[PDB]
Design an enzyme around this catalytic site. Sequence first.
Site, short mmCIF file in Angstrom:
data_model
loop_
_atom_site.label_atom_id
_atom_site.label_comp_id
_atom_site.label_asym_id
_atom_site.label_seq_id
_atom_site.Cartn_x
_atom_site.Cartn_y
_atom_site.Cartn_z
CE1 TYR A 95 -3.35 -3.00 0.68
CE2 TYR A 95 -4.54 -1.01 0.03
CZ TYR A 95 -4.50 -2.38 0.20
OH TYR A 95 -5.61 -3.14 -0.11
CD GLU A 137 -7.25 -5.80 0.62
OE1 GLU A 137 -6.03 -5.62 0.84
OE2 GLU A 137 -7.95 -5.00 -0.04
CB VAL A 276 -25.11 -14.83 -17.84
CG1 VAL A 276 -24.61 -16.14 -17.26
CG2 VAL A 276 -24.06 -13.74 -17.64
CB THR A 279 -21.91 -21.57 -18.22
OG1 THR A 279 -21.84 -20.58 -19.26
CG2 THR A 279 -22.30 -22.91 -18.82
#
EC number: 1.14.12.17
Length: 403
Positions: A95, A137, A276, A279
């Site tokens: 970062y 995260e 879509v 799949t």
Amino acid sequence: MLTQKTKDIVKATAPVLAEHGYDIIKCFYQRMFEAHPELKNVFNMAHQEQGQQQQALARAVYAYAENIEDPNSLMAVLKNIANKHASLGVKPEQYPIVGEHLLAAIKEVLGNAATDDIISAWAQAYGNLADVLMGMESELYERSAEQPGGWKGWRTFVIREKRPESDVITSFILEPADGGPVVNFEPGQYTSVAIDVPALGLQQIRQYSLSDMPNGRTYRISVKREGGGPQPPGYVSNLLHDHVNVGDQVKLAAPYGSFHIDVDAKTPIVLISGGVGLTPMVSMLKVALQAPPRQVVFVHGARNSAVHAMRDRLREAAKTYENLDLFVFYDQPLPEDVQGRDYDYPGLVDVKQIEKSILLPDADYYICGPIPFMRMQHDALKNLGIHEARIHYEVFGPDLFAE
Ligand SMILES: Cc1cc2nc3c(=O)[nH]c(=O)nc-3n(C[C@H](O)[C@H](O)[C@H](O)COP(=O)(O)OP(=O)(O)OC[C@H]3O[C@@H](n4cnc5c(N)ncnc54)[C@H](O)[C@@H]3O)c2cc1C
Ligand code: HEM
Ligand code: NA
């Protein structure tokens, strides 16, 4: 933490950063890669058309300015980014590096417009967003590691089977090289494939949706061969098709992504699909129609009857499941296609014509299809007063123009 004055500067100057978005990132990449060439193994080295990047970047800047006063909505938009980072393997120590080069690029490109108060305001913005993302995260990494069959970083897999699906799509069945269990995933989630690209002499990373349902021991990804002719062929998709065969090994990230039905909740689900096919949409359809009854609405946006496999599978499901409503749109129906029978409404999906049906209390909206389509529907729903946290969209599958 940002003071109100700082937030006001960000909001007042966002239009200018958006204006120079592409030039800023272009200069950013140049500077950062000369200082830290190792980062070329994490960023996509394929050039993209200027017009599209500019659009995407401008949208990102405006999204931040729009939600800076609403922490609940900001966190919502940030969680999609956190998941993408986890998949890529972004680390806390990276970062500061990105921050330095990004701020230098803004100052250089903005020139006169880059006053001391403006640079400092965005420097704080960056620092705050970095702080929040790193934590999110960190949580994701931690959760994965402690999952049965989970892991952090890359884990080597072996291609067991390679099955051509059409002239452009091929499926890859993957198994861990260590033969141990593999962590579960929810339909809609993806993995990232890290592979060396000979032409570049660098590693490149690309995301692929996880197909089918988890089975504890193998994963399947469906890859569409990209580029060719007017467009320079894509690096990884062609590499996988032509040079990755049964027996070879690749590195995969554990499953991530916020785009997936929450099978625990009992609230209504609204699925808006703009192209879509089956799949891995049938997998997500399955989850939605699971026990017990949940109010589900499916909005299928197709072109016409030419390809109508998804359209029929749906009417099949709608026939059986009681709490399921289906609407079909044809943006360019055929002479033989007649409203009320082959479809319900002409044109692209327009939520404004089925408001009574989608404006359900406490509903979650899942949108998939081309990127432009997803942005359009996202914005349409916001105008109807739907909260950011309730809108979910992501690139889903090998062909967003399936039907
Ligand atoms: C969450 C997620 C899930 C995904 N799931 C799937 C999936 O299930 N199946 C799947 O097939 N894909 C999926 N993708 C797409 C996949 O990640 C890759 O983006 C795709 O395979 C193409 O990568 P590439 O390396 O082949 O192309 P790249 O080398 O990255 O090229 C990208 C595009 O740019 C074009 N291009 C290259 N150079 C230039 C230039 N100078 N000027 C203009 N245009 C250029 C290329 O032809 C190609 O069309 C997903 C993406 C995300 C974000
Ligand atoms: C506060 C800082 C950061 C912000 C706000 C930010 C935001 C973003 C956004 C909005 C995207 C696109 C999201 C999407 O497509 O869904 C993105 C992509 C990406 N980010 Fe982050 N990011 C930050 C820091 C970093 C850092 C530190 C790295 C690590 C080297 C990084 C690496 C990437 C990569 C590789 C991509 C994928 C696109 C590409 O290949 O170029 N980001 N980031
Ligand atoms: Na630095």
